[PDB]
Write an enzyme that holds these catalytic residues in place. Sequence first.
Site, PDB file in Angstrom:
ATOM      1  N   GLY A 102      82.808  21.323  61.494  1.00  0.00           N
ATOM      2  CA  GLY A 102      83.264  22.246  62.511  1.00  0.00           C
ATOM      3  C   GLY A 102      83.290  21.719  63.924  1.00  0.00           C
ATOM      4  N   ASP A 145      80.548  33.561  68.000  1.00  0.00           N
ATOM      5  CA  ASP A 145      81.491  33.056  67.011  1.00  0.00           C
ATOM      6  C   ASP A 145      81.236  33.634  65.626  1.00  0.00           C
ATOM      7  OD1 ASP A 145      83.788  31.616  66.827  1.00  0.00           O
ATOM      8  OD2 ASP A 145      82.819  29.728  66.258  1.00  0.00           O
TER       9      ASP A 145
END
Length: 289
Positions: A13, A122
């Site tokens: 990520g 997030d």
Amino acid sequence: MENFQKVEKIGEGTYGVVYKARNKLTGEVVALKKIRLDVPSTAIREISLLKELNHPNIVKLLDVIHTENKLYLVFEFLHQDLKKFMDASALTGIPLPLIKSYLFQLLQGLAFCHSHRVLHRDLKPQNLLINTEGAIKLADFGLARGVPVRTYTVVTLWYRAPEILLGCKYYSTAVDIWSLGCIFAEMVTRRALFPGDSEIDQLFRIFRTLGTPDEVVWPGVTSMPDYKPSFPKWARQDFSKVVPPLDEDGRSLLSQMLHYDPNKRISAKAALAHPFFQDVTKPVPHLRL
Ligand SMILES: CCS(=O)(=O)c1ccc(Nc2ncc3cc(Cl)c(=O)n(C4CCCC4)c3n2)c(C)c1
């Protein structure tokens, strides 16, 4: 470090890649997030402050290892996230008692972090980890601010609150409640709520559903940085079309988490007292690890 034996790559990520690791000394199976640092003194304190975050619905940060141009973060290991579980249930559908238990558990972990003035920023289904005992935990908290991996990691946009998309620089805890509402709707309908492709398509998909906001429902929206008077003026759609299986209690609860005004959006604490969780239980899932 050599104290850990990489088993398999379980993720990748933002400037970070996560492995399934086994502590060669203790034998513990952990999640090892590698972050190539090329060292912020300010950040490694806030990372040490999340090591104190302690709640049954939060993936525990076990250790923080700083070694050279790398920051290794050791986490508690889980076998499946909510994204893999929703895909394995796309044809059958997650039962509402399991959805209700999950949403209740995530609101508890959110209520714990927000009381400590900690945002997740997030929130997405890939960040929500589940075990066989029916528990769900928040994972991979986003810091307020390393080298990006060239192999690279779009779906973060699908759960952004409208205030972040309109250019608000100072986020509140309401941004996490908005993301949870999108996840809640996705679990029920087995489809993404606002699957946008750009920052403006994400905004316009929200506008097409909830109506274009004005100074009536969101006072001060026209003074937001990325707001434009030339936005199309779409009408709000009926909530019975958004989540067409869900009951009135859920649609009521979902409507409060999807409020445009972050000051009108329901808090995690208040959401726990919603009548939708009157008969909340804790069922077990059917996981294939
Ligand atoms: C791959 C899709 S899956 O559903 O097969 C699956 C899902 C989860 C896990 N495990 C796991 N255990 C602990 C953490 C701790 C943290 Cl902090 C963390 O970020 N992540 C991942 C979530 C974001 C990318 C890394 C973790 N992942 C596995 C093995 C498979």
